[PDB]
Design a protein around this ligand. Structure first.
Ligand SMILES: CC(C)CCC[C@@H](C)[C@H]1CC[C@H]2[C@@H]3CC=C4C[C@@H](OC(=O)CCC(=O)O)CC[C@]4(C)[C@H]3CC[C@]12C
Lengths: 99, 147
């Protein structure tokens, strides 16, 4: 970034890059707020089923954070919500909240 | 529970042997009662503004409807929790009143009453505490929206 502005080809590009980063920082803050909301919600929902799930996605705080963050890029599977037991209500609420 | 629950859902742990596990599971902690009286105060304020403005004008704003629904859902979660705890303390009263032993596990109980000794996995799919947990999670997710 210290070198690109000298190029007439690459200067304006880098300027627009700084601009759009400065702009989207605010939406990143708002997304942090809503993401923290949903994270704490689903964590409180699923924390009791440590050894009753397909995987360990929403069992702890850090793992819930990992799962929900990787869900942004579609890199998280939807089987993380399913339970092993027959508590249909909890897993339905999980489906609804994740969607 | 930030780092995970300590005991598996299959195991039942109790402070003193005579007590029913559901009494241990469904009792109100102090922060939960703080949340409860908090929800009661917020509901009082919202109902006061409803009585002032009138239902017709009150329903028009969709965000006010969202707030009313969130408060009612918190109330519903705590009501289901309290029904679970009432069944818990009634089974506890039965156990402490009629049967005498050192540990409850060795005793065989009437089935309708013995059900309240089961662990998390055995629980009926429509237990009021399950409804409480689900509605409480939804209510937390919605309460975070008041920003
Ligand atoms: C292809 C691999 C092996 C090397 C890639 C190197 C680039 C990542 C960096 C290192 C050296 C840099 C260049 C060093 C000197 C210049 C001249 C500089 O100025 C000009 O455009 C000429 C007119 C003027 O200098 O006023 C513009 C940036 C540029 C191309 C830099 C652009 C970014 C470069 C190509």
């Amino acid at each position: 970034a210290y070198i690109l502005p000298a190029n007439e080809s690459f200067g304006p590009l880098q300027i627009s890059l700084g601009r759009t980063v400065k702009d989207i920082f605010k939406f990143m803050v708002l997304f942090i707020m809503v993401f923290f909301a949903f994270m704490i919600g689903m964590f409180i929902l699923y924390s009791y089923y440590l050894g009753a799930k397909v995987n360990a996605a929403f069992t702890t705080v850090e793992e819930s954070f990992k799962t929900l963050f990787w869900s942004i890029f579609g890199l998280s599977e939807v089987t993380s919500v399913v339970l092993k037991y027959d508590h249909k209500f909890i897993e339905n609420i999980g489906y609804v909240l994740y969607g | 529970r930030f780092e995970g629950i300590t005991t598996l859902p299959n195991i039942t742990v109790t402070d003193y042997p005579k007590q029913i596990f559901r009494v241990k599971t469904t009792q109100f902690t102090w922060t939960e009662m703080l949340i409860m009286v908090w929800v009661l105060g917020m509901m009082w304020s919202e109902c006061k503004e409803l009585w002032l403005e009138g239902p017709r004008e009150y329903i028009l704003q969709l965000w006010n409807v969202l707030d009313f629904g969130m408060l009612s859902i918190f109330i519903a979660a705590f009501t289901a929790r309290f029904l679970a705890f009432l069944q818990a303390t009634k089974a506890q009263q039965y156990v402490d009143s009629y049967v005498q032993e050192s540990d409850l596990s060795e005793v065989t109980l009437p089935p309708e009453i013995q059900y309240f000794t089961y662990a998390r996995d055995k629980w009926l799919p429509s237990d009021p505490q399950i409804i409480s947990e689900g509605l409480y999670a939804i209510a937390v997710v919605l309460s975070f929206s008041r920003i």
